[PDB]
Write a protein that holds these residues in place. Structure first.
Motif, PDB file in Angstrom:
ATOM      1  N   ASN C  76     -16.710   0.003   9.964  1.00 49.16           N
ATOM      2  CA  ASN C  76     -15.576  -0.552  11.247  1.00 49.16           C
ATOM      3  C   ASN C  76     -16.115  -1.891  11.633  1.00 49.16           C
ATOM      4  O   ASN C  76     -15.391  -2.447  12.466  1.00 49.16           O
ATOM      5  CB  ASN C  76     -15.690   0.384  12.655  1.00 49.16           C
ATOM      6  N   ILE C 142      -6.747  -3.801  19.858  1.00 44.67           N
ATOM      7  CA  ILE C 142      -6.470  -2.152  19.896  1.00 44.67           C
ATOM      8  C   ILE C 142      -5.841  -1.954  18.392  1.00 44.67           C
ATOM      9  O   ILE C 142      -5.209  -2.866  17.776  1.00 44.67           O
ATOM     10  CB  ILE C 142      -5.501  -2.044  21.190  1.00 44.67           C
ATOM     11  N   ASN C 143      -5.922  -0.787  18.207  1.00 41.54           N
ATOM     12  CA  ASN C 143      -5.474  -0.206  16.761  1.00 41.54           C
ATOM     13  C   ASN C 143      -6.111  -1.094  15.688  1.00 41.54           C
ATOM     14  O   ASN C 143      -5.430  -1.490  14.880  1.00 41.54           O
ATOM     15  CB  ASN C 143      -4.020  -0.403  16.642  1.00 41.54           C
ATOM     16  N   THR C 144      -7.274  -1.372  15.767  1.00 44.58           N
ATOM     17  CA  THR C 144      -8.228  -2.246  15.022  1.00 44.58           C
ATOM     18  C   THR C 144      -9.263  -1.799  14.205  1.00 44.58           C
ATOM     19  O   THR C 144     -10.223  -2.417  13.903  1.00 44.58           O
ATOM     20  CB  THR C 144      -8.585  -3.529  15.854  1.00 44.58           C
ATOM     21  N   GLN C 147      -9.255   3.312  10.462  1.00 41.85           N
ATOM     22  CA  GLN C 147      -8.411   4.426  10.638  1.00 41.85           C
ATOM     23  C   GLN C 147      -6.826   3.542  10.691  1.00 41.85           C
ATOM     24  O   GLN C 147      -6.058   4.075  10.038  1.00 41.85           O
ATOM     25  CB  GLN C 147      -8.462   5.385  11.851  1.00 41.85           C
ATOM     26  N   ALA C 148      -6.691   2.736  11.544  1.00 44.19           N
ATOM     27  CA  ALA C 148      -5.615   1.951  11.731  1.00 44.19           C
ATOM     28  C   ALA C 148      -5.318   1.065  10.544  1.00 44.19           C
ATOM     29  O   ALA C 148      -4.194   0.675   9.949  1.00 44.19           O
ATOM     30  CB  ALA C 148      -5.748   0.932  12.922  1.00 44.19           C
ATOM     31  N   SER C 151      -3.904   3.163   7.670  1.00 44.45           N
ATOM     32  CA  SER C 151      -2.299   3.418   8.007  1.00 44.45           C
ATOM     33  C   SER C 151      -1.398   2.234   7.554  1.00 44.45           C
ATOM     34  O   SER C 151      -0.611   2.501   6.963  1.00 44.45           O
ATOM     35  CB  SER C 151      -2.272   3.936   9.440  1.00 44.45           C
ATOM     36  N   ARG C 152      -1.709   1.120   8.220  1.00 37.89           N
ATOM     37  CA  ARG C 152      -0.935  -0.151   7.905  1.00 37.89           C
ATOM     38  C   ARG C 152      -1.124  -0.526   6.413  1.00 37.89           C
ATOM     39  O   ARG C 152      -1.947  -0.020   5.643  1.00 37.89           O
ATOM     40  CB  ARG C 152      -1.565  -1.343   8.723  1.00 37.89           C
ATOM     41  N   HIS C 154      -2.416  -2.227   3.312  1.00 37.44           N
ATOM     42  CA  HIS C 154      -3.952  -2.447   3.000  1.00 37.44           C
ATOM     43  C   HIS C 154      -4.066  -2.391   1.494  1.00 37.44           C
ATOM     44  O   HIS C 154      -3.380  -1.943   0.732  1.00 37.44           O
ATOM     45  CB  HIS C 154      -4.839  -1.378   3.803  1.00 37.44           C
TER      46      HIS C 154
ATOM     47  N   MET D   1       3.709   0.861   7.104  1.00 35.39           N
ATOM     48  CA  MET D   1       3.058   2.025   6.550  1.00 35.39           C
ATOM     49  C   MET D   1       2.745   2.276   5.120  1.00 35.39           C
ATOM     50  O   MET D   1       3.444   1.620   4.166  1.00 35.39           O
ATOM     51  CB  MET D   1       3.969   3.539   6.625  1.00 35.39           C
ATOM     52  N   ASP D   2       1.486   2.618   4.906  1.00 30.76           N
ATOM     53  CA  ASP D   2       0.830   2.857   3.594  1.00 30.76           C
ATOM     54  C   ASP D   2       0.563   4.336   3.407  1.00 30.76           C
ATOM     55  O   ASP D   2      -0.381   4.844   4.124  1.00 30.76           O
ATOM     56  CB  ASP D   2      -0.146   1.890   3.065  1.00 30.76           C
ATOM     57  N   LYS D   6      -1.264   5.642  -3.743  1.00 32.53           N
ATOM     58  CA  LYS D   6      -1.626   4.546  -4.595  1.00 32.53           C
ATOM     59  C   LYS D   6      -3.262   4.767  -4.936  1.00 32.53           C
ATOM     60  O   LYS D   6      -3.633   4.759  -6.105  1.00 32.53           O
ATOM     61  CB  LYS D   6      -1.333   3.102  -3.759  1.00 32.53           C
ATOM     62  N   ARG D  65       0.823   3.471  26.251  1.00 33.30           N
ATOM     63  CA  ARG D  65      -0.425   3.234  26.822  1.00 33.30           C
ATOM     64  C   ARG D  65      -0.276   2.019  28.018  1.00 33.30           C
ATOM     65  O   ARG D  65      -1.172   2.102  28.690  1.00 33.30           O
ATOM     66  CB  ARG D  65      -1.100   2.911  25.827  1.00 33.30           C
ATOM     67  N   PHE D 224       4.689  -0.479  12.425  1.00 36.33           N
ATOM     68  CA  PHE D 224       3.708   0.588  12.556  1.00 36.33           C
ATOM     69  C   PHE D 224       2.345   0.064  12.575  1.00 36.33           C
ATOM     70  O   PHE D 224       2.283  -0.719  11.687  1.00 36.33           O
ATOM     71  CB  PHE D 224       4.106   1.542  11.444  1.00 36.33           C
ATOM     72  N   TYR D 225       1.633   0.629  13.456  1.00 38.17           N
ATOM     73  CA  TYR D 225       0.371   0.077  13.889  1.00 38.17           C
ATOM     74  C   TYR D 225      -0.875   1.140  13.278  1.00 38.17           C
ATOM     75  O   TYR D 225      -1.962   0.704  13.409  1.00 38.17           O
ATOM     76  CB  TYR D 225       0.167  -0.257  15.187  1.00 38.17           C
ATOM     77  N   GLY D 226      -0.294   2.165  13.165  1.00 40.41           N
ATOM     78  CA  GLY D 226      -1.495   3.473  12.776  1.00 40.41           C
ATOM     79  C   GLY D 226      -1.888   3.977  14.150  1.00 40.41           C
ATOM     80  O   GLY D 226      -1.469   3.353  15.291  1.00 40.41           O
ATOM     81  N   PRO D 227      -2.755   4.927  14.039  1.00 42.38           N
ATOM     82  CA  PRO D 227      -3.436   5.625  15.025  1.00 42.38           C
ATOM     83  C   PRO D 227      -4.730   4.772  15.786  1.00 42.38           C
ATOM     84  O   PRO D 227      -5.157   4.551  15.128  1.00 42.38           O
ATOM     85  CB  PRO D 227      -3.981   7.197  14.840  1.00 42.38           C
ATOM     86  N   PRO D 228      -4.646   4.612  17.141  1.00 43.20           N
ATOM     87  CA  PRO D 228      -5.686   3.977  18.144  1.00 43.20           C
ATOM     88  C   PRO D 228      -6.897   5.061  18.125  1.00 43.20           C
ATOM     89  O   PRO D 228      -6.871   6.200  17.816  1.00 43.20           O
ATOM     90  CB  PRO D 228      -5.000   3.721  19.239  1.00 43.20           C
TER      91      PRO D 228
END
Lengths: 26, 243, 239, 243, 26, 239
Positions: C76, C142-144, C147-148, C151-152, C154, D1-2, D6, D65, D224-228
């Protein structure tokens, strides 16, 4: 306490219901 | 169901079967099980809503022997003659039911305050009446109707009544209609399978309501149990036709 | 795609990418993010005058600062981060010819491609992740997480195999254009030169053998796949 | 989103994918993002309107939030469980939104006084609650609803509730859903890009209201930012199935 | 005063946000 | 069959074997013994009533006890040996669902498949041989060398490459059926639960480098390709 909560040991099984062995329930 | 014509081996002559009386008086047939279950039953007759609580819980289950009054037992908020309704007597024959129920809620008011009716899906508990969720002493800042769950509002000034249809949001194929003892402490997951969720009524200020229940259009019953052991004393409270 | 038997120059089955007057080879396979679209249609409305491209300057590969990965780095942890285009103009590779059009034009739309080349030995191991966050101004903290990032959009880099990674970055911004440069005469009410953020993060810490190297290096390279500029002005120094 | 398929290079044999449970219980699918955002969220629960002010401001932005309560911080008029709604959790994944929002406003009254709801387009500010515009002490002669802006009236005697749909009247392509710190003093034009305008409720006499919000039909989300990073303590306030 | 208003100088850039140089923010 | 260039998850060109509700992958190539026939025709005569199969239970992969190979082990040394089916019922993997039909049926015919997976490092080296001896009762201590193993149906395991090995074992017995279980009421005149023996032997000792690992491990897995049961009885515990 509330007598409906738990069945007496002589008539019941481990799962707190009338045993299949105990025929006299009827 | 076993008709029992199997056991009837006799094939001797008999008297005439005649003609049916169905349709003679009127075409309003009232023999259909679904038609009987779809007409409403009074659950709660003028019961208080209090804003100090989360709301008045209504467990999603049809009328049956589960809600039957017995002379001597502790006083509940339930209507005493639920067990003696036609549809309660029918539901005592079927231990399975699937589909939606419809709840007619009437708020005894003409005020502009909104009264919210929130649907809770099957969570595994079974409660009724006023309850403080997690035993707090404040619910105006954390209302159940503004937590995310599906909700509908009543505005008595417009209409004091509403009819809401609750879905079959559960894990099980069928919902269990009744148990032998409703107050018995047995396996906790099985204990909660007699409901498919809850319906929670939350007011602004103190006000009374009345609640009816009926089966939806999308509704089925199964697992026929046959008639139980019963009692009656109707004869005693009526004169005969010979004085 | 398939390796061959050893010869005078080892396993000579390399691939390569040529863009303008710059070439980058690769010894092993590469991972590439999905080609995803940008906002189109607003360009013709937002700018009354026509927009311009300078492919020869902007679409070439340009290396930026080196990234060091150590055994001390935990999951992280940010190895590096880039606010784009700002950091490619006035922090990294400041004398690059890629930056020349940003001196004169005030607005633009920008689609980028970022290649990452790692060089750890075969007795090391570890995982690094690079991701992009679109329109990140006042939402970088945030969302950094890892895991984020997963999702984005990458790319994932194994530090033993030295597989290459190519992140395709579209233009996804809440306005039609992004501002290229701040100025003393210009307003301070709008944050310029930032339509996105790039994060380089540890996914699994670097590990090594007995008496092995306690670090290894990764080198990013950038290029614009589609850089359209708008609003010509007098030339200024970048930041 | 990814998706990340892949990275999944393994192509060995696996167990069966089986058959989906979607449609088995009911046809009421609740997986669509737009369907989740289109059902209402309680913002304000019985908050006062005061005629000494211009009106009660509601900033045009979806639940997220940004409106989340944290134990210890200053007490606001907002509902505490906005951050824990499904749609707030969804909006925390998308930093862009475009289109209309729908606001259900209920006035706690049955009086014949008209309560006006005025739409303000994107002006660059971000406020909520009762406010005196330009710090005056009189607004009956200069009401916001009679300045020229688009306005709708509620007449509680007829209907205490209304649903109004506010347009996407802004300069920007997308509206910004959230920031890392909502109280940070940064570049002032960027600060106001989290809203697309305001909705202002003005009464005649002192009266309470409740406010819900949902997405319109013409509505999209993106970026889309994904989960925090998140926390939970739900386990602690419930018994298990083994007592 | 309110500490959320302005970010401390050592961690931030001129635009009142975490600097790209400041890696320890995570 | 052919390796590829390195990617995010290395050389992702693995093969695998799926049997019932069990999967086993392999990183490198596998060696497989010849598919050879069993005795057929006697089944219908030996049993007047029809025989039964339970493929879902018996034809799945089941791992047995781990085998340790050390540098101390010399050529011809037994690493492990198995009298089958006996040892797969009441010694190894006793709680396996593969063993359920053996509780109730007294007789059977059994064709097996045994997969061996080794995990030694690239700086080690050695050779192990696994072979089968049909109808081995009172002939285990003769024709039991590495040379006899090389003659009989066998598989060879290199301890550096970690190639997999699959031994296909038919039913070759001097009677029509093999007895599944001994019992207090049953006769002691016939030895039950043994129609064959499996030997795991060192062909060339394990060797390692300076400061290297002095051991490595092999894991056998078994399954019945054709398990036909006969003579139903009351269920009993296995041995």
């Amino acid at each position: 306490d509330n007598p409906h909560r738990f069945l007496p040991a002589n008539v019941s099984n481990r799962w707190n219901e009338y045993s299949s062995a105990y025929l006299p329930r009827v | 169901m076993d008709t029992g014509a199997k056991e009837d081996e006799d094939e001797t002559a008999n008297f005439s079967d005649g003609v049916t009386a169905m349709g003679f008086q009127s075409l309003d047939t009232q023999v259909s099980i679904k038609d009987i279950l779809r007409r409403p039953v009074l659950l709660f007759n003028h019961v208080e809503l209090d804003p100090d609580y989360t709301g008045f819980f209504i467990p999603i289950m049809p009328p049956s022997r589960m809600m039957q009054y017995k002379s001597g037992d502790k006083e509940t908020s339930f209507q005493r003659l639920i067990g003696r309704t036609p549809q309660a007597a029918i539901m005592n024959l079927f231990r399975f039911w699937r589909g939606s129920l419809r709840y007619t809620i009437i708020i005894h008011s003409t005020d502009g305050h909104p009264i919210y009716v929130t649907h809770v899906p099957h969570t595994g508990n079974r409660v009724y009446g006023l309850m403080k969720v997690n035993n707090l002493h404040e619910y105006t800042k954390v209302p159940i109707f503004g937590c995310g769950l599906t909700t509908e509002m009543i505005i008595p000034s417009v209409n004091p009544s509403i009819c809401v249809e609750v879905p079959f949001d559960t894990e099980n194929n069928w919902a269990v209609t009744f148990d032998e003892d409703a107050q018995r402490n047995y396996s906790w997951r099985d204990k909660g399978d007699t409901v498919t969720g809850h319906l929670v009524v939350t007011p602004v200020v103190s006000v009374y309501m009345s609640v009816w229940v009926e089966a939806g259009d999308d509704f089925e019953v199964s697992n026929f149990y046959g008639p139980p052991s019963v009692k009656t004393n109707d004869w005693n409270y009526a004169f005969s036709d010979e004085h | 795609e398939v390796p061959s038997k050893e010869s005078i120059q080892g396993d000579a089955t390399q691939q390569s990418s040529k863009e303008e007057n710059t070439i980058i080879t690769r010894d092993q396979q590469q991972t590439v993010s999905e080609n995803i679209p940008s906002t189109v249609g607003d360009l013709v409305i937002a700018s009354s005058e026509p927009t311009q491209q300078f492919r020869s300057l902007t679409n070439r590969w340009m290396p930026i600062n080196s990234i060091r990965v150590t055994v001390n780095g935990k999951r992280n942890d940010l190895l590096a981060q880039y606010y784009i285009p700002e950091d490619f103009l006035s922090t990294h590779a400041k004398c690059a010819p890629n930056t020349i059009p940003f001196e004169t034009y005030v607005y633009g739309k920008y689609e980028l491609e970022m290649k990452f080349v790692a060089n750890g030995n075969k007795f090391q191991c570890g995982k690094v992740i690079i991701s992009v966050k679109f329109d990140s101004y006042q939402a970088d903290n945030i969302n950094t997480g890892f895991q984020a990032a997963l999702s984005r959009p990458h790319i994932m880099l194994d530090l033993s195999t030295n597989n290459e990674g190519v992140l395709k970055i579209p233009f996804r911004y809440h306005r039609a254009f992004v501002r290229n440069q701040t100025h003393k005469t210009a307003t301070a009410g709008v944050r310029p030169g930032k339509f996105a953020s790039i994060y380089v993060q540890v996914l699994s810490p670097l590990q090594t053998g007995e008496g092995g190297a306690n670090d290894m290096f990764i080198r990013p390279f950038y290029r614009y796949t589609r850089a359209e500029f708008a609003g010509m002005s007098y030339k200024v120094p970048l930041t």
